[PDB]
Write a protein that binds this ligand. Structure first.
Ligand SMILES: CC(C)CN(C[C@@H](O)[C@H](Cc1ccccc1)NC(=O)O[C@H]1CO[C@H]2OCC[C@H]21)S(=O)(=O)c1ccc(N)cc1
Ligand SMILES: CC(C)CN(C[C@@H](O)[C@H](Cc1ccccc1)NC(=O)O[C@H]1CO[C@H]2OCC[C@H]21)S(=O)(=O)c1ccc(N)cc1
Lengths: 99, 99
């Protein structure tokens, strides 16, 4: 797809086999979800955004699918106010910003 | 250009007569700069991100030149950790996400 930016660029994403939606966010280094329950242990990680920091749970080798592209990546789970697909995942699906 | 996302997508911007650098951020609704001095009246606003809220000043009808494309629109000013170009500005230059 070729997505304009008049509205927030949410995409359908299946993460851990669960159908969710998340914002394609070129300003985010990492992919973060708030409304998923992933299996197994996780490791503590911290991320920093506009208003300060959050403690997140880092889950590794998680399957992610967007627009037919299935990849294996790192997913953070934490109190983000909105699910975001970061550059880590977007590079895997070959997304670019164009103008 | 076509911008891959292996590194943070910074672009050169001219705002308030000054050359600045800012992150092209499709997860940001609005453009925000730190420490730039704009003429005219502003209104107080708040923006919300990961980690909490940010107090900013909103200036309207601000010319911005983004990697050499002219736009007139809203510019927020406040202590963001990184200057961001948001969707409000990127829609004015026809930016799209492609995958
Ligand atoms: C979370 C988004 C929906 C909103 N943010 C834009 C976002 O792209 C920020 C943009 C950003 C970038 C750096 C620092 C602060 C904010 N990125 C971000 O928080 O990323 C975090 C997750 O991955 C990590 O990598 C970058 C920081 C971590 S935001 O900075 O809060 C924001 C909110 C409103 C406006 N108008 C402009 C920006
Ligand atoms: C920095 C501005 C973008 C925001 N200002 C918020 C304010 O808390 C800032 C917070 C602030 C200020 C500067 C840089 C980062 C953050 N403080 C401030 O101006 O303090 C002044 C008095 O001491 C002087 O030296 C320090 C700054 C000067 S503000 O214009 O008054 C403001 C207040 C409320 C809202 N909603 C939106 C904006």
């Amino acid at each position: 797809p070729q997505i304009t930016l008049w509205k927030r660029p949410f995409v359908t994403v299946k993460v851990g086999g669960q159908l969710k939606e998340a914002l394609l966010d070129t300003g985010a280094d990492n992919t973060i979800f708030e409304d998923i329950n992933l299996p197994g242990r996780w490791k503590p990680k911290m991320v920093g955004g506009i208003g300060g920091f959050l403690k997140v749970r880092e889950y590794d080798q998680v399957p992610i699918e967007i627009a037919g592209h299935k990849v294996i990546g790192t997913v953070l789970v934490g109190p983000t106010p909105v699910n975001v697909i970061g550059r880590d995942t977007m590079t895997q699906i070959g997304a670019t910003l164009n103008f």
